[PDB]
């Protein structure tokens, strides 16, 4: 059984695969924040701008098994078109994402990507693993495909992240009342340390889902 907040088909707004058509499956619930604004000030992760509470979003609901979830995901894809790709996010997807769901997605011809905070062990069979480390949280996933760090966070050892085993190293401006400020920072960082690339949240500029 799976608790999904919302399922929608759009272009990936951020990360190394920005611009790529994909179905986003946003799981409900996270392990680093309840989702309530009264808890944010003392949460482990306090800068989240995503609503992952409940199952009331678009195509959201409580799915009984993987095939029921895959059917909904596959249904959102343009008929007769290949290159099927799903992004598992939330929320923290590793709270619910299991192997039976992964096998069912691969069976449907879907490539699987995951956006995880890195505080939980991930499934190796996932095609693209994106880790976004939270500074005040433990990081148990020290290898993957891309490391997308949101800056700035206090207690952050940014240069130490480059020692990890990832193919892509990105910094992403923290959105909020200081987005433009943090963007300047991220750009300045990459230029000074060219190992890092900029991850822009393009979907917030293009105003797309």
Ligand X SMILES: C[S@@+](CC[C@H](N)C(=O)[O-])C[C@H]1O[C@@H](n2cnc3c(N)ncnc32)[C@H](O)[C@@H]1O
Ligand Y SMILES: Nc1nc2ncc(C(=O)O)nc2c(=O)[nH]1
Which are the catalytic amino acids? 24, 30, 45, 48-50, 115, 203
Per CB under 8 A, 18 contacts its own copies: yes
Q: What are phi and psi of 192, to 5 degrees?
A: -80, -30
Which residues, numbered 124-163, are part of the site for its own copies (CB under 8 A)? none
Give the C-alpha separation, 141 to 122, whole Å.
Answer: 7
| Residues 70/88, Cβ–Cβ less than 8 Å | no
Give the binding-site size for its own copies (rule: CB under 8 A).
33
Considering CB distances under 5 to 8 angstroms, the limit depending on partner class, which of ligand SF4, its own copies, ligand Y, none binds residue 48? ligand SF4
Give the C-alpha separation, 68 to 4, whole Å.
Answer: 12
Per CB under 6 A, 6 contacts ligand Y: no
Please list the residues that pair with 86 across neighbouring strands. Answer: 23, 112
Per CB under 6 A, 50 contacts ligand X: yes
- Compose the 99-138 pattern: x for residues touching ligand X by CB under 6 A, - for all others: ----------------xxx--------------x------
Nearest to 13 by CA among 115, 94, 106: 115
DSSP 92-125: -GGGT--HHHHHHHHHTT-EEEEEE-SSS---TT
Which residues, numbered 115-144, are part of the site for ligand Y (CB under 6 A)? 115
Binding-site ranges for ligand X (CB under 6 A)? 30, 47-50, 89-92, 115-117, 132, 148, 150, 172, 174-176
Binding-site ranges for its own copies (CB under 8 A)? 9-11, 17-21, 77-78, 81-85, 170, 183, 187, 190-200, 202, 205-206, 208
């Amino acid at each position: 059984t799976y608790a999904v907040k919302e399922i929608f088909y759009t272009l990936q707004g951020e990360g190394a695969n920005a611009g790529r058509p994909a179905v986003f499956c946003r799981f409900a619930g996270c392990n680093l924040w309840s989702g309530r604004e009264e808890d944010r000030a003392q949460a482990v992760c306090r800068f989240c701008d995503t609503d992952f509470v409940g199952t009331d979003g678009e195509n959201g609901g409580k799915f009984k098994d993987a095939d029921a979830l895959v059917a909904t995901i596959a249904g959102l894809w343009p008929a007769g078109e290949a290159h099927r790709f799903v992004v598992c996010t939330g929320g923290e997807p590793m709270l619910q994402l299991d192997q039976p769901l992964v096998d069912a997605l691969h069976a449907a011809g879907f490539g699987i990507a995951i956006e995880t905070n890195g505080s939980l062990p991930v499934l190796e069979s996932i095609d693209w693993i994106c880790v976004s480390p939270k500074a005040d949280a433990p990081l148990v996933v020290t290898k993957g495909n891309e490391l997308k760090v949101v800056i700035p966070q206090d207690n952050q050892r940014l240069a130490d992240y480059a020692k990890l085993d990832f193919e892509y190293f990105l910094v992403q401006p923290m959105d909020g009342p200081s987005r433009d400020l943090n963007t300047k920072l991220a750009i300045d960082w990459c230029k000074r340390h060219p190992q890092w690339r900029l991850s822009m949240q393009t979907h917030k500029y293009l105003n797309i889902p």
